[PDB]
Amino acid sequence: EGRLTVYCTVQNEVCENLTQKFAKQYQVETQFIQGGTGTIFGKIKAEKDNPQADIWVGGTIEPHFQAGELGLLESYRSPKQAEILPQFKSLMEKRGDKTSIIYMLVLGFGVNSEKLQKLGVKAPQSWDDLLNPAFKGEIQLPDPRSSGTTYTIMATLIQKLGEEKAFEYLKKLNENVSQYVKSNLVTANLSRGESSASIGFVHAYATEKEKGAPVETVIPAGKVGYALGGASIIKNARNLENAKLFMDYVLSAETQELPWREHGVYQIPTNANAKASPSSVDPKKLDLLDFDFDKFGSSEEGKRLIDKWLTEIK
Ligand SMILES: Cc1ncc(COP(=O)(O)O)c(C=O)c1O
């Protein structure tokens, strides 16, 4: 007899499972709208004066942080925050009044081994390998209007190279890009062989390969970029009590195992008590950047960089 609307940036089948299970557990009529991180961020900004959802589940965390700075989020600290991996303690001190961490993702390349043979080039192992002229028209990555992935790409390259060389690299990469599309289409196009290599979070490439696509994952040489999955309650939510229960729910260990146990999707749990699938990469074995989520969570910085992508890249 209660209600709840979830803006959902995790996979559609996971959104469906999460909301259906919650609805039965609490007798709450639960609806969701699925969208990329940038898509949902845009909706929340546009709907500020009359919100159409109560909680935003999933998506890269810097747009969540930015929404918080813009006054778009409710303050609420779930008791389940205590179970977040301790490496995120300091970040949750600064941002956790309005955004919680519910998973993590590693940024890498997906490559279609069949397309690779057809182009006659070896699988790329470095960022600069993607600039090979043999890759003209064969690279895809997501459009930053819809996709938090592409903001993570920008932030990764800026931390690796400095901003000037980051945008120099992206301009050279743009010459090999066929089109920028929604992240899930990037993944689908790679599996089908419309593209030869893509940049994105690597859990999707593990799922694609397990489901029979000729796709391999590459962790690019050098420092590794990554993302956190955010969850935030929307300011002036219609259904605040149910939004808090849903927040507690997605912060719980069992809920963070449901993606791999029930859907073969491999976002890495951030609840210290949850078990990860062996198909997820282990970030502890990678050369992670000391990723400055707090800096790129600035609303000023996020808008400046998205506008700069749109003006300088295309
Ligand atoms: C669980 C999850 N979170 C976040 C993302 C990022 O999606 P997008 O780049 O469209 O914002 C993805 C897509 O790869 C995803 O599968």
Numbering used by the authors: 1 to 314
Cite, word for word, the article reporting this structure.
In this study, we structurally characterized P5PA and found it to be a type II periplasmic binding protein capable of binding the active form of vitamin B6 (P5P). The periplasmic binding protein sequesters a specific substrate and recruits it to the permease–ATPase plasma membrane complex, which uses ATP hydrolysis to induce substrate influx from the periplasm into the cytosol. P5PA is encoded by the p5pAB operon in A. pleuropneumoniae. In this study, we illustrate that P5PA transports P5P, making it the first reported transporter for the active form of vitamin B6 in prokaryotes.
The purified protein was crystalized and subjected to X-ray crystallographic characterization. Using molecular replacement (MR) with AfuA as a model, the structure of “APJL_RS02700” was solved and refined to a resolution of 1.75 Å (see Experimental procedures section and Table 1). The resulting high-resolution structure revealed a typical type II periplasmic binding protein with two β-strands connecting two globular domains. However, the binding cleft located above the β-strands at the interface of the two globular domains revealed clear positive density indicating a possible copurifying ligand. Further in silico screening of potential ligands containing six-member rings and phosphate groups indicated that the active form of vitamin B6, called PLP/P5P, best fit in the unmodeled electron density. The model of P5PA with P5P in the binding pocket reveals a network of hydrogen bonds and hydrophobic clefts that primarily hold the pyridine ring and phosphate group of P5P in place. While Tyr103 interacts with the pyridine ring nitrogen and His203 coordinates the pyridine hydroxyl group, the phosphate group of P5P is stabilized by collective interactions with the side chains of Thr37, Ser147, Thr149, and Ser183 and the backbones of Thr37, Thr149, and Gly148. In addition, the dipole created the N terminus of three alpha helices beginning at residues Thr37, Gly148, and Ser183, respectively, and create a positive environment for the negatively charged phosphate on P5P. Moreover, the hydrophobic interactions with Gly36, Leu105, and Gln267 contributed to retaining the P5P molecule within this binding pocket. We determined a dissociation constant (Kd) of 36 ± 7 nM, which suggests that there is a strong interaction between P5PA and P5P. Our structural analysis of P5PA suggests that it is a highly specific transporter for P5P and does not possess the capacity to transport G6P because of a lack of hydrophobic interactions required to mediate binding of G6P.
